[PDB]
Design a protein around this ligand. Structure first.
Ligand SMILES: *Cc1c(COP(=O)(O)O)cnc(C)c1O
Ligand SMILES: *Cc1c(COP(=O)(O)O)cnc(C)c1O
Ligand SMILES: *Cc1c(COP(=O)(O)O)cnc(C)c1O
Ligand SMILES: *Cc1c(COP(=O)(O)O)cnc(C)c1O
Lengths: 404, 404, 404, 404
């Protein structure tokens, strides 16, 4: 079955009534008829007992995301941040190191700096490229972390070669696939990534409504080489990793996704491939039409022939994707543009509305200047997350704003 | 205003339309009209930008819980577990120690063992009593953690004397007030606790519906003595602690409560004092009527005159409270009782339905035998969370089950 | 089982997972595996096919309301208004007459005037008292409609004697039991009413949140005497009436209650008896303390010894109930009182907040002056729907306002 | 702005916080600070007082549907059925006649037969074609009712010529635009229809989730000629019609849409044009590929060159649309096909899943045989509502089923 097919069918429960959709299990606990039945659900983890460990509505969304990313197993949690955090928490010990791409989401850098520091972990930031990664490896490296498309630098890493290196070094390649849109734009596991994390808040939801995140992994022998699975590997084989994300992330840290949120995210997936296709058509149109404009200092879009991302885009992404950036030259010209444009400015991505933001003063404002510049963030840069609006209507609004 | 008054009025928003209740802000992002407006909301944290940091619906529930616990500030998160974890994460550094009561919730022990170990922290478990705590203090102690009512041991710590000791040692007294029912049964901050954490899933919700948790703190000078607030103390004074729970727990770890869950929890608080009063009336009735029964080896209920908890209950709790336990003598007699009783068995508390559970095989099954016994869990023990049903109907069901 | 017991247990589904609560079936349609299976669900109405006819979440709320009102069958619909309308639509033909109490809810009078006029029906308004009803009967009378407690006149009809008369005349006694709080304060079916309708929006919900209504009926031979059940009586016996409310109200007019609303109403019932008891305790306290105040021209409360409603209250209601009125003497004094009182003014009832309103200018403003006066509405009258707040806090706010 | 643009922007509230989306006003009542403020909101209908009359969440969905259908005003209600019923209730008096197309939705025929009969109205059924309509006019005709695309006969009426005739006769042309997908496939008001009604449950929702309906009208002088607007026309001009649908449908009959449902429908509109385009691309592909198959007796699809609907489709619809039918020849061959096909059978339309149904035994089973045949329903007929799945995957499932 094709992605569009799986997206409306995968994960639908076998409802006793024939229900064509997903009931919302907004219930905290599940009862049992005897001491023994209770004892067996607690011992084996089968059946339900309490919603913080698992819930049938979240399970449907896991099964659908599993089908769409082509994974072994998915675990959903309260947000994208919670998923990045739970995945790393399940991998790492005090004294470990991570080798992380430089271009990362500002809260991933914040989480790495302020929380993984507390778990005793050090991070080395590098260009997400095999040789730079190689030369950062040490005896203590336990994970290589990159994003499918750097945001906002819009660089696409060579995933397959990074996965071969990670596999050869005995470490996990963890890919933040937030920009790959739950597999609709990219499926990093298919190229050899061991773990994907992502914010479902973005493209998967599609409506800038509620928060969710996911961790997914693939069948691999890697986890045999992590001591925490030697104290699970025998019992669970490659499922030992997602079971520990579950245990640590949900049972213990309690980062549980509401079944109301699971239900909305489950439905947003039904149109993700259609939406991402439309946004990316429009983004390529806007890229082509705006790149030669005199007031546009630089336009980055991975599907432009001469773009730096175009090589790796053509291999890993289904299209040029839904994001582009403009450099207006400086703060002053960005300001006038954003003040003039009759489109929303907000810090979200993958909404059905086209959204513009100034990373230097918002998404990346909690970082020092050097760190902004290293992430491809400059004072002229404006990021555009393209929505579902008519491409001619959008171009007219851009043109008009540029007149200001 | 009295608690019952505050519970239906506190935290109601000033709605532009006059709305008597709480709209659900199921929106991810908040837009701005200029580069500069965006930049100012990011710099100052005022106004809204993105739902993972804050949301008007969660804010209403914080303001109500603040009023009800009599706190300086509340922060809500995705679950009780997330709140215990975020509070400790905001307090602790690798190498710190915690001194924790022995009787604790099994997932709090699990979180301490499996996650706080990863943050480099060691825990010393003691009887929650001033001298045992005193003699456990070391140069590295950074927190004393107890529960308002030990579950299921039903012992009530001497909070005021523990708070005086913590204050004198320069460490935080953190109280899990899950059993104090959002201030309706106990307000630990009023006795000098620095921090309360709690599961709103339980009594506050009242319907065994959705998960939520809260962290609250009081005005105190203690945080001046924690280095992390010296790198905040000047800018924020006693609000530095809840601001860091927010930052670490929500911004970074992303343990965000859904606005659908906030809305349901906000409403459950409107009846918590009424429900807790009814449950506790009924629990005292069942305690009195069952304690002399020949098949009941031991009945614990804090409001029974000769109960070990009765001293500290009379001081700290509004009543004997909604929980009691029976010891049937052994596994075999517990089994027959639970199989025979025409009441639900499930692992939840503070639901409107009376719930029974066998801690030895469920809530405490992930602990070694010694740890079960030290928590007051034995193979004969059955815990009862008393709901809203008629007390005579309930007694008849107990009597009848005991015949088996 | 007692009412409080039934309210947390009745209508809980037999969930395949043991769920202790009610999943929300927010699904439009239910599928089938063969042409024949589809054909059989359509023929027999068994199983599910489409949410406008029936839905498992609404069914749970029907079963609980059935248990609580002590009915044969309940049907839920989108609002209290929809239920009054559907019930009458299932009873009446063009040319029929209704004999209706004078004191009625303003929208019931509006529905009777503006919509039942369109269905060809005439209404005779009378004092809700056996002899006045008797003398209004004609060959064309098809229903006697009264409210359990007139609002705001606070008169309680002699239900048992009205039901004996209706039964003797061969016509339905239809009781709006909105004030009887889903059976917690009154159960009209138990006294011989054939049909109850009510707004669940009010006391049953308890949180001034979402709209719902219900129609319920009892086992009776009456429907054999209505021709529409002779074209059903044989097949369904006393269930012919609720089946037709379903068919006309839901299948055809499509007045369907959302499963999100059913879920919230199902939970509000879990505390209705506790809330109604508390409100009514407080209302009796406020009645007693305010009735002798010099600025209070008249105070009506059914549980006051000398009140006109007290006779019939003592027989039919569980207590004096949660509503009282004050007459300030005139418009000018009502105005100052309501402007001065630090309590909410809004047009809703049975919320957890005490609510005040001026019927002459609001709830009854769409009626001519004569009709207001006949409903017990005067320019001095203020209606109080007592909430869950502390009674001393409330009395202080009243006293203080009266100073103005 | 183009339809796709309006669909993500129209109706977004001016939120005090900048919220990019729609808060859910799950609140029953709106308070006021003085007797006078209350009195003025009741007199003028401005501002809010009680959710049965209006609610900010429903208002956003009305404003968006207004923009998308290009209407004067929209009113939302609990279901498609409620909207058809409320619209006619606002138009008609006892003794009026309606002239209605023969091919109609089975519940519209049921509503006409079983409920409009109770309002004293007679219906004449005709081919939805100017001359047949003309010759059915009488002095008593008050409305001509047709559906944008007959279901399942798939005939498209000549709307513009029907609107010219209705306008010339002084009667309303009421169009059920359920198949025109909230204006994405057809906008009947743009061709001169006076009133549109539709089920938002179908294409607008897009997820087979919750029920909603809408009534919309256009600026017209027609309502001056209806006596009920002469007792409103002066005060409100063409808005007198939607104000009366509101008053009768919502204030009085209480057919109110839940704000949870409004919120889900508001979001489903954001992708309706994209979804309808994809479904209709796929439907045309399946039409073309299946029409020559030997086991397919007849295939109807409006976008096939020689189809009977193709003339009027090319004028009124944006494409061939998302529905097609197959005639398998008889009951026995339909049965084998439907039993064999690995696609869902359910009675819903415009879901993201492709749905098949056998109208003779389901959607039209409550009609006599003659009425089925007159609606284009035969024992061989299978209706397909095309979803979002891959067209090659779908064709393979059809081909395979036809082998059976
Ligand atoms: C937004 C985002 C996240 C975080 O997800 P939330 O649900 O917002 O926590 C993580 N990674 C990337 C690339 C993101 O864009
Ligand atoms: C249930 C419970 C928790 C955890 O809360 P969740 O919302 O269930 O995580 C924490 N402490 C105590 C005492 C509890 O009983
Ligand atoms: C409020 C009320 C109604 C109507 O119910 P809604 O859900 O508001 O339509 C009907 N009867 C009485 C007495 C009411 O008070
Ligand atoms: C389904 C449908 C309706 C009714 O809408 P509900 O929301 O299901 O009542 C009305 N007209 C047509 C053509 C329909 O298909």
């Amino acid at each position: 079955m094709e992605y569009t097919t799986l997206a409306v069918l995968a994960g639908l429960p076998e409802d006793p009534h024939g229900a064509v959709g997903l009931p919302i299990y907004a219930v905290a606990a599940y009862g049992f008829k005897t001491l023994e039945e209770g004892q067996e659900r607690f011992a084996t983890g089968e059946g339900y007992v309490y919603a913080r460990q698992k819930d049938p509505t979240a399970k449907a969304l896991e099964e659908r995301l599993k089908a769409l990313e082509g994974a072994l197993e998915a675990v959903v949690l309260a947000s994208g941040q919670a998923a990045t955090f739970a995945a790393l928490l399940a991998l790492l010990r005090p004294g470990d190191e991570v080798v992380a791409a430089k271009g990362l989401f500002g809260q991933t850098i914040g989480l790495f700096g302020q929380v993984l520091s507390l778990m005793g972990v050090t991070v080395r930031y590098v260009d997400p490229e095999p040789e730079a990664v190689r030369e950062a490896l040490s005896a203590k490296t336990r994970a290589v972390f990159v994003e499918t498309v750097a945001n906002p630098a819009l660089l696409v890493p060579d995933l397959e070669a990074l996965a071969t290196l990670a596999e050869e070094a005995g470490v996990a390649l963890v890919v933040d696939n937030t920009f790959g849109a739950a597999g609709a734009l990219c499926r990093p596991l298919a190229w050899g990534a061991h773990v994907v994390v992502e914010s479902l808040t973005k493209w998967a939801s599609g409506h800038g409504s509620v928060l969710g995140g996911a961790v997914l992994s693939r069948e691999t022998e890697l986890w045999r080489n992590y001591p925490q699975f030697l104290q699970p590997w025998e019992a669970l084989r490659a499922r030992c990793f997602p079971e520990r994300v579950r245990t640590l992330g949900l049972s213990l840290c309690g980062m549980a996704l509401s079944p109301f949120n699971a239900y909305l995210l489950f439905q947003g997936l039904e149109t993700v491939a259609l939406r991402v296709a439309r946004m990316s058509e429009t983004a390529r149109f806007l890229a082509e039409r705006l790149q030669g404009h005199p007031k546009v200092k630089a336009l980055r879009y991975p599907g432009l022939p001469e773009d730096p991302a175009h090589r790796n885009a053509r291999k890993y992404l289904a299209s040029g994707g839904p994001i582009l950036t403009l450099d207006l030259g400086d703060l002053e010209r960005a300001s006038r543009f954003l003040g003039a444009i009759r489109l929303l400015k907000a810090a979200n991505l993958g909404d059905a509305r086209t959204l513009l933001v100034h990373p230097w003063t918002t998404t990346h404002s909690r970082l020092k200047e050097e760190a902004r510049l290293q992430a491809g963030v400059t004072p002229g840069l404006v990021r555009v997350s393209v929505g579902l609006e008519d491409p001619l209507d959008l171009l007219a609004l851009f043109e008009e704003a540029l007149e200001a």
